[PDB]
Ligand binder design. Structure first.
Ligand SMILES: *[C@@H]1O[C@H](CO)[C@@H](O[C@@H]2O[C@H](CO)[C@@H](O)[C@H](O)[C@H]2NC(C)=O)[C@H](O)[C@H]1NC(C)=O
Ligand SMILES: *[C@@H]1O[C@H](CO)[C@@H](O[C@@H]2O[C@H](CO)[C@@H](O)[C@H](O)[C@H]2NC(C)=O)[C@H](O)[C@H]1NC(C)=O
Ligand SMILES: *[C@@H]1O[C@H](CO)[C@@H](O[C@@H]2O[C@H](CO)[C@@H](O)[C@H](O)[C@H]2NC(C)=O)[C@H](O)[C@H]1NC(C)=O
Ligand SMILES: *[C@@H]1O[C@H](CO)[C@@H](O)[C@H](O)[C@H]1NC(C)=O
Ligand SMILES: *[C@@H]1O[C@H](CO)[C@@H](O)[C@H](O)[C@H]1NC(C)=O
Ligand SMILES: *[C@@H]1O[C@H](CO)[C@@H](O)[C@H](O)[C@H]1NC(C)=O
Ligand SMILES: *[C@@H]1O[C@H](CO)[C@@H](O)[C@H](O)[C@H]1NC(C)=O
Ligand SMILES: *[C@@H]1O[C@H](CO)[C@@H](O)[C@H](O)[C@H]1NC(C)=O
Ligand SMILES: *[C@@H]1O[C@H](CO)[C@@H](O)[C@H](O)[C@H]1NC(C)=O
Ligand SMILES: *[C@@H]1O[C@H](CO)[C@@H](O)[C@H](O)[C@H]1NC(C)=O
Ligand SMILES: *[C@@H]1O[C@H](CO)[C@@H](O)[C@H](O)[C@H]1NC(C)=O
Ligand SMILES: *[C@@H]1O[C@H](CO)[C@@H](O)[C@H](O)[C@H]1NC(C)=O
Lengths: 183, 49, 135, 370, 37, 146, 49
């Protein structure tokens, strides 16, 4: 806010400030454009699914353990433990909230809150994870297509020049290696 | 060297219809575009170089 | 006390009603109990007039909250939007809906194979240059 | 007979003498706010055999310019009176009209009790009424006059249903008087017809003074169209005498392609209207806009000063018998007293008084230590 | 050119692009013919 | 259906219109900035010279000069950033035209939603328009597999 | 305001408004570049996804 930041609610200061023309209509537009762009960025990155999917209640994927990335229903917020660690490791100063130095901003400097709540982003991520672990990559073309996870892994091996018999001959070893690596 | 204009242009004539007691012609960006005639009571037309 | 004021309105070619959002102000205080000859804006006729809802991004005056799930038109903040439609028409402030709920079916001995295709043509627009100038 | 009515879209004039066309322009000047009450003051005095005391010339505050509207035939109301006390000890204004003249002056006019009335007050049989005069009782010390072309003229209307509402707005600022007027015809059935009209400048006059009241000089010698009732408290009646009050608002006018103002919008009435003013357009698209800020106005002022009784001895320093040499200047101390800096001018006729860090005008509003 | 565009006589001009639309059209036609044939 | 869809929805070409709208608004603001006093006696040079003697009239008009210079600097300062973002968009468009049009693309969701077949470019004012032809499975039927 | 009369208070007060405008302009000038950097990073992240 120009008027409050430059002038301490003084009529004379405002009257002299009005003589400078439009040197604050521009400064009240660039920040709005920036805010619109930042609101659009998170929608352009995450909102890529037409609908919201859900993983089946029975979770057995041939030995692969996905409990560290799927949502945890025990917590009040549906966030995976990795997401919990990431949230804890980063501390925001003020966010938006509602109302020691953040209270010293009586001078017309404020912060707008983001449009998308963290729960919505978590739901988007959960939908993407369910789609990518249940339907493979086929859900990026049209609607989701069923396929068992071991065959999808064999097909990914086939896509990089390794014969698909390798996975079926070494399924347990690869599952254990993945479990150890993600742990 | 008018009565408070001191303009400079290629002023020829105004064909527009003007209100009887108005002298200063103005545009979107607030520039002079008309001058009253002190003798013939005719609206002139300021035009730049 | 001071804060930002915003006007949420539909297209003036359609209707003539507006709503007022007070940014980042707990509206249990003066903003709900405004008084004449006390506030900077000359207009105080709205006052409270009921239909006062509390949002995490401020206080919304003039819009009745309804709990549904639509694809929102006018963003507000903190997962709240507004739109001018039916509940006689008025302005409502619902909660943003991410999309239609769906549940996939998974099995370890089933696979789905398409039997037909469809050719489609889309479009894509990209700017390449802007107008030159000199001073 | 006093009643209140709402003025919808009246009380607007040309901001300046400058032509402007087919754009939207913003001005800040004293205007009549949209959607404000206008009071109806009516006169009831007719018939000679029977009648009642009139008391039909109320005093109006004239709070920094007023908006005048009245519907009559040609000359029922004439003249307008200003001043602050309207007595022999104070100056009063006598802007009055004539057949083909206008009389304007300011003087020490003592008495204006009642205009000359023949008590007949009956124009239904004989309509011969002329030269009532009794403009003033006496003039004491005054020479200024403004004998010139009359401000108001009558309009001819035939076949009936052509009545003209007369809009006069007066500007009394910076010691000068400005009058803007225009005749609005087609007052067929609506007392305050909806629409838009524009006023035009007439003349300026350097009066000055501290005018703080208004008086009406309606001609009650021959009156007509005089309904009577005890209406009060925002009711409807008939007065043919409208008065308004001007506030310092901001409007955004819409000049047409011919230079005539067609539509005007208030910038301080409705948040929709304020948004329109902010966007400088008459159409606003769906969305959310950040317009302005709101602040809580103060209630009163408080002054907290230490309580000291005795006065400061500036006379002991300035009015001294002997002053020491420059190389042995003596320093005196002034403390524990109330200092008045507007009295040291009298002690000596000095005028250099070159003062460096603080303006001498406002030395009385700061508290020091020594 | 010989209202706002003619009003910018204070020194703010607009230069024309080097490539006219009739040459961009030729480029597009050549690309289409090459990618079809 | 491309012609009918373009003719029906008018907001499809919203990316190209902003390019000229922003420049027009910037030029309009730059022109309008001249009618500002900039904390001086007047905003017109002729009157300020004709009303005052040289020694302080010269002092008075320096404020106008510095204000106009400050107004002019911001215009090019913003134009530089706008030109940079337009260059980024142009590079992206050049890459798209060199990859999707002159061959087949294996990148997922780059030259259209689905599987890529071809692409035909079209010319628009201050821009380029592509027409991606894609392939999409339609009818599903599950089975039992080993 | 409370210590200098308006004729020189206007002169003194003009030396603060210019400084505060010049200090405020730099903030938005740098934010306009940080926003471009963040937008480029967001585009890269969207492509990677
Ligand atoms: C998948 O992994 C999780 C953790 O990596 C396993 O949960 C752990 O189980 C052991 C013993 O069963 C406990 O001691 C730990 O406290 C558990 N940790 C958590 C975070 O729950 C889980 O058992 C694994 N899945 C299967 C099927 O064994
Ligand atoms: C694959 O889809 C196409 C298009 O929907 C089907 O072709 C349609 O067939 C029906 C009945 O045979 C006709 O009424 C339509 O006019 C056809 N459409 C077109 C565009 O020609 C085709 O039959 C489908 N394939 C299978 C195996 O059912
Ligand atoms: C100090 O001396 C001067 C001059 O001798 C006195 O000045 C008088 O001040 C009063 C104050 O109202 C005036 O009415 C007189 O006209 C002044 N006379 C002259 C000759 O200047 C001053 O009064 C003396 N100080 C005191 C406290 O008496
Ligand atoms: C707002 O004010 C109310 C009443 O004082 C209080 O109970 C509440 O905690 C405050 N904060 C909110 C609602 O976020
Ligand atoms: C949610 O909707 C139901 C049904 O209309 C209503 O009874 C309830 O009060 C609503 N809750 C809130 C918090 O508005
Ligand atoms: C598929 O998963 C179920 C769930 O545990 C299991 O009982 C079944 O044996 C699995 N299928 C095969 C072929 O092993
Ligand atoms: C105008 O009249 C209304 C009608 O009751 C009244 O409430 C109001 O106080 C009056 N004055 C103004 C300035 O609105
Ligand atoms: C009205 O005008 C007539 C004609 O000029 C003049 O004789 C008369 O004195 C005027 N009335 C007054 C009150 O001056
Ligand atoms: C007012 O008029 C009287 C005569 O009517 C005169 O004696 C007196 O001086 C006048 N007042 C002033 C202040 O001149
Ligand atoms: C402006 O004047 C022309 C010429 O008579 C007229 O045709 C047009 O209607 C006028 N515009 C208005 C009245 O808005
Ligand atoms: C420039 O001159 C040519 C040659 O006569 C003429 O055709 C054209 O109209 C002129 N351009 C103008 C008048 O803007
Ligand atoms: C195929 O899917 C449908 C619905 O999802 C289901 O009813 C059917 O049993 C499935 N086919 C097999 C062989 O399981």
């Amino acid at each position: 806010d120009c008027t409050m930041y430059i002038c301490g609610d003084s009529t004379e200061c405002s009257n002299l400030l009005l003589q400078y023309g439009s040197f604050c209509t521009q400064l009240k537009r660039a920040l709005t454009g920036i805010a619109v762009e930042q609101d659009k960025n998170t929608q352009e990155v995450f909102a890529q699914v037409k609908q919201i999917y859900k993983t089946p209640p029975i979770k057995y994927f041939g030995g692969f353990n996905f409990s560290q990335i799927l949502p945890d229903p025990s917590k009040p917020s549906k966030r995976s433990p990795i997401e919990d660690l990431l949230f804890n490791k980063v501390t925001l100063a003020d966010a938006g909230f509602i109302k020691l130095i953040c209270a010293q901003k009586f001078n017309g400097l404020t912060v707008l809150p983001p449009l998308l709540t963290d729960e919505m982003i978590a739901q988007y991520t959960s939908a993407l994870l369910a789609g990518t672990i249940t339907s493979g990559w086929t859900f990026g073309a049209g609607p989701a297509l069923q396929i068992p996870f071991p065959m999808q892994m064999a097909y990914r091996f086939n896509g990089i020049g390794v014969t698909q018999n390798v996975l079926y001959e070494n399924q347990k070893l690869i599952a254990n290696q993945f479990n150890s690596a993600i742990g | 060297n008018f009565n408070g204009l001191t303009g400079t242009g290629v002023l020829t004539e105004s064909n527009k219809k003007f209100l009887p007691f108005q002298q200063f012609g103005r545009d979107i960006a607030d520039t002079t575009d008309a001058v009253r005639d002190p003798q013939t009571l005719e609206i002139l037309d300021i035009t730049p170089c | 006390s001071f804060g930002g004021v915003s006007v949420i309105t539909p297209g003036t070619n359609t209707s003539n009603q507006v709503a007022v959002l007070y940014q980042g102000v707990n509206c249990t205080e003066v903003p709900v109990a405004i008084h004449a000859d006390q506030l900077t804006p000359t207009w105080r006729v709205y006052s409270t007039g009921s239909n006062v809802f509390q949002t995490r991004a401020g206080c919304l005056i003039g819009a009745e909250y309804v709990n549904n799930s639509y694809e929102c038109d006018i963003p507000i903040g903190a997962g709240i939007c507004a739109s001018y439609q039916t509940q006689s028409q008025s302005i409502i402030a619902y909660t943003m809906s991410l999309g239609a709920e769906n549940s996939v079916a998974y099995s370890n001995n089933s696979i789905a194979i398409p039997t037909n295709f469809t050719i489609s043509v889309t479009t894509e627009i990209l700017p390449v240059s802007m107008t030159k100038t000199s001073v | 007979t006093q009643s209140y009515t709402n003025s919808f879209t009246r009380g607007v004039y040309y901001p300046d003498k400058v032509f402007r066309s087919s754009v939207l322009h913003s001005t800040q000047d004293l205007f009549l706010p949209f959607f404000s009450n206008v009071t109806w003051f009516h006169a009831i005095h007719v018939s000679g055999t029977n009648g009642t005391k009139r008391f039909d010339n109320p005093v109006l505050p004239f709070n920094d310019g007023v908006y005048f509207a009245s519907t009559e035939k040609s000359n029922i109301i004439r003249g307008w009176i200003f001043g602050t006390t309207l007595d022999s000890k104070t100056q009063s204004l006598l802007i009055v009209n004539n057949a083909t003249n206008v009389v304007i002056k300011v003087c020490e006019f003592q008495f204006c009790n009642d205009p000359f009335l023949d008590v007949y007050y009956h124009k239904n049989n004989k309509s011969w009424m002329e030269s009532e005069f009794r403009v003033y009782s006496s003039a004491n010390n005054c020479t200024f006059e403004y004998v010139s072309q009359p401000f108001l003229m009558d309009l001819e209307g035939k076949q009936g249903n052509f009545k003209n509402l007369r809009e006069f707005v007066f500007k009394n600022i910076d010691g000068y008087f400005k009058i803007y007027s225009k005749h609005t015809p087609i007052n067929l059935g609506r007392d305050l017809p909806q629409g838009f009209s524009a006023l035009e400048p007439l003349v300026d006059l350097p009066i000055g003074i501290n005018i703080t009241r208004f008086q009406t000089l309606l001609a009650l010698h021959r009156s007509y169209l005089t309904p009577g009732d005890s209406s009060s408290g925002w009711t409807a009646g008939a007065a043919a005498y409208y008065v308004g009050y001007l506030q310092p608002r901001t409007f955004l006018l819409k000049y047409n392609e011919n230079g005539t103002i067609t539509d005007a919008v208030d910038c301080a009435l409705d948040p929709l209207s304020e948004t329109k003013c902010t966007l400088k357009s008459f159409t606003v698209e769906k969305g959310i806009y950040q317009t302005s800020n709101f602040r809580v106005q103060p209630t009163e002022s408080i002054v907290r000063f230490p309580n000291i009784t005795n006065l400061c001895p500036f006379d002991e320093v300035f009015n001294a018998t002997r002053f020491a040499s420059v190389y042995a200047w003596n320093r005196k101390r002034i403390s524990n007293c109330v200092a008045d800096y507007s009295v040291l001018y009298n002690f000596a006729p000095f005028f250099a008084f070159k003062c460096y860090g603080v303006s001498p005008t406002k030395l009385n509003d700061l508290c020091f230590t020594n | 050119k010989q209202l706002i565009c003619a009003q910018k006589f204070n020194g703010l001009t607009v230069l024309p692009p080097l490539l006219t639309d009739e040459m961009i059209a030729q480029y597009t036609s050549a690309l289409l013919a090459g990618t079809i044939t | 259906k491309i012609q009918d869809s373009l003719s029906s929805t008018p907001s499809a070409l919203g990316k190209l219109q902003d390019v000229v709208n922003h420049n027009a608004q910037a030029l309009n603001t730059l022109v309008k900035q001249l009618s500002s006093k900039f904390g001086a006696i007047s905003s017109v040079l002729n009157d300020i010279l004709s009303r005052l003697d040289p020694p302080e009239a010269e002092v008075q008009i320096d404020r106008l000069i510095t204000g106009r210079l400050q107004s002019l600097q911001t215009y090019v300062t913003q134009q530089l950033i706008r030109a940079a973002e337009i260059r980024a968009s142009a590079n992206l468009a050049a890459t798209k035209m060199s990859e999707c049009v002159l061959g087949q693309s294996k990148r997922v969701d780059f030259c259209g939603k689905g599987y890529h077949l071809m692409s035909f470019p079209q010319s628009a004012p201050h821009g380029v328009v592509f027409l991606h032809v894609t392939y999409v499975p339609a009818q599903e039927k599950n089975f039992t597999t080993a």
